[PDB]
Amino acid sequence: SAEDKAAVERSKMIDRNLREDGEKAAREVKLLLLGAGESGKSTIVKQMKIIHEAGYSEEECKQYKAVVYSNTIQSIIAIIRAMGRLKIDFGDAARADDARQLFVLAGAAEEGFMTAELAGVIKRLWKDSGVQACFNRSREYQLNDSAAYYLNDLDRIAQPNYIPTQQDVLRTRVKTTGIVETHFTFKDLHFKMFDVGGQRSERKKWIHCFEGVTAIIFCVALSDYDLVLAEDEEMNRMHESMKLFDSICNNKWFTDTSIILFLNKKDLFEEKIKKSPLTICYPEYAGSNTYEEAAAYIQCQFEDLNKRKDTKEIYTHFTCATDTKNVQAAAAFVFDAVTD
Amino acid sequence: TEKDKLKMEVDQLKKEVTLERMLVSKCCEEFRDYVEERSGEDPLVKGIPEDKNPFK
Amino acid sequence: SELDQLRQEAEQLKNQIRDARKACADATLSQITNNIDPVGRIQMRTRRTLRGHLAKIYAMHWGTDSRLLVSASQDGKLIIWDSYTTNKVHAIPLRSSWVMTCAYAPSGNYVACGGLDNICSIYNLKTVRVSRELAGHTGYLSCCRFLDDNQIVTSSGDTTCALWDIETGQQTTTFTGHTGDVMSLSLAPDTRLFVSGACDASAKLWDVREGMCRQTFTGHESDINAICFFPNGNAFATGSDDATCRLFDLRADQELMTYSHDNIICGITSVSFSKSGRLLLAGYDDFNCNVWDALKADRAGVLAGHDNRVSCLGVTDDGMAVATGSWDSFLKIWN
Ligand SMILES: Nc1nc2c(ncn2[C@@H]2O[C@H](COP(=O)(O)OP(=O)(O)O)[C@@H](O)[C@H]2O)c(=O)[nH]1
Secondary structure, three states, rough: HHHHHHHHHHHHHHHHHHHHHHHHHHEEEEEEEEEOOOOOOOHHHHHHHHHHHHHHHHHHHOHHHHHHHHHHHHHHHHHHHHHHHHOOOOOOOHHHHHHHHHHHHHOOOOOOOOOHHHHHHHHHHHHHHHHHHHHHHHHHOOOOOOOOHHHHOOOHOOOOHHHHHHHHHHHHHOOOOOEEEEEEEOOOOOEEEEOOOOOOOHHHOHHHHHOOOOOEEEEEEHHHOOOOOOOOOOOOOOHHHHHHHHHHHHOOOOOOOEEEEEEEEEHHHHHHOOOHHHOOOOOOOOOOOOOHHHHHHHHHHHOOOOOOOOOOOOOEEEOOOOOOOHHHHHHHHHHHHOOO | HHHHHHHHHHHHHHHHHHOOOOOOHHHHHHHHHHHHOOOOHOOHHHHHHHHHHHOO | HHHHHHHHHHHHHHHHHHHHHHOOOOHHHHOOOOOOOOOOEEEEOOOEEEEOOOOOOEEEEEOOOOEEEEEEEEOOEEEEEEEEOOOEEEEOOOOOEEEEEEEOOOOOOOOEEEEEEOOOEEEEEOOOEEEEEEOOOOOEEEEEEEEEEEEEEEEEEOEEEEEEEEEOOOOEEEEOOOOOOOOEEEEEOOOEEEEEEEEOOOOOEEOOOOEEEEEEOOOOOOOOOEEEEEEOOEEEEEEEOOOOOEEEEEOOOEEEEEEOOOOOOEEEEEEEEEOOOOOEEEEEOOOEEEEEOOOOOEEEEEEOOOOOOOOEEEEEEOOOEEEEEEOOOOOOOEO
């Protein structure tokens, strides 16, 4: 025919483009982040943009304004609610009125704005010694690790012309519910990094989608070791992370995938281990309660879960994911492990 | 949350309990008879002549 | 606790429903068909191989002309094929490669797809460009089917289904009730109802107009990954991680037949009836599609042309062919 020839030629042209695209895709480095909630995955993704793509524009930063405020409000609310549960009194009784007003105001707040009234309530609460006593007992409830970051900077944050900084954006907890993907180039190679931490669905229905990735970066919050085991009491948080790592590292879907282990939040760990003993997490631990020996112990507890040890190496690095210079050095570590 | 989930499940079950269900035998007969009127012309049952197969 | 009272009440109502279903199980499908002759050995051959994807294929859907079909792969491509000639008509570059479902509009004017981006994207074939990105689900898109060029229904890992107005991009209706990821849906012939299958191991029948669940069907021991209506609109089939397919009857409100064999312990990914309903075709994790006699529960044939999981399949509206798609990156056309 006439049309039939053109349809054949169209198909052949599609075939060429598909082949060229596949050849470019076979050359890219694909990195999947995994790890428990709050372990640092979305922070690492943002750090790749800051390091390799010049960070965030001012207009991009303006868009995190509303989540900075929502994060801040939810942090102080969490501390106040815990005072009732832990039976902690205010340092000044007048703060009870402020606490009441906190809840009234939080319902009336408009996104992207914080009234001077609400800012003053939060400031007075955060300064109160009873609120601070509860904050310092955060291992007994659920409190995100950026709480003090924002609350200590409330004066700057609350200005009507406030524009979030890049560090502010790094610290935000925006809960996307879908996959997050970032692309960059590092030494003439195309990298793609994925984070599914926002997905609340059933992991067994899509983990196999990542069979074939070059490497997994598994993130662990070192500072989770002393969190009290509460409603669900099968395992403490660190042992839940160990069970997930055991599952991933030894997974049939990742036989040919390099396993990188980021033992993250080392800055919070270094401070916690001064007053909170590792035995809270590992009752059998008989070493000293110091940064170096306790960190080593955790590293070995995870590395020991590798079952194909003889064929498979774990690339372990201690990180502070909110420190761009620290992440840039760990990134170099990761490059070496995967490219060759 | 969970309590809110149980209330809705209970509400839904209260509706489903009131359904008037047909005998399985009757439904099976109707299923069979629908298939029997048509399986004789079903290409994946009876096969296709080579000359009439558009995928030859 | 009040919590204690609600849990026991739910179990009591589930038991009442179980008893009422039992009170209507006066006979079984196997008895009713005892006198029908077996279909005999079904032996189909691969007639067309659709080569082009470079990674796992996750879904496919036939156009209503029984000739064109769309496939979706995590190579990041939606390909529209002319199955008669194997020519590629379109190769659409997705914005997110993590696709899990696709659909061909009955008119032939649009296709849809989505996945881990939690978005259902609509593509106009008759301008190819992204016409709409339907945002609202909080979990992956697992299945989607057009009612017409203006409305589409979706299922999601967020445990809901939704009906969308494509022009406005808004969810017109949300279908809530499943307690696990929803994996598949199928529209009734008259598009007034649809059924969904979920990781709570149940299937649900939904009223499109009134946005409510009418019936909840139970019996599977693990996730339902695939669901397909029977052509007369009064029954449907499910395929499950529990290595069984089952036939469910709407008006009996209960399971009629299980299709399984002690040999088969792997999961089922996809189910379809042949045009008459005599055959139920199912794709399996073990790389095969098994062809069941829907009336007798005997396995009548096998389709074994793949080197990895059969992830999807579909029968043409004219009944002339079945398509299989696979993690091995191929689709095959059989009859
Ligand atoms: N101090 C400190 N905070 C961190 C570190 N890594 C992450 N965070 C913070 O901890 C919180 C949870 O981290 P995020 O990346 O959102 O965890 P994700 O759930 O795995 O994505 C965020 O507020 C981060 O700012 C770290 O190494 N040190």
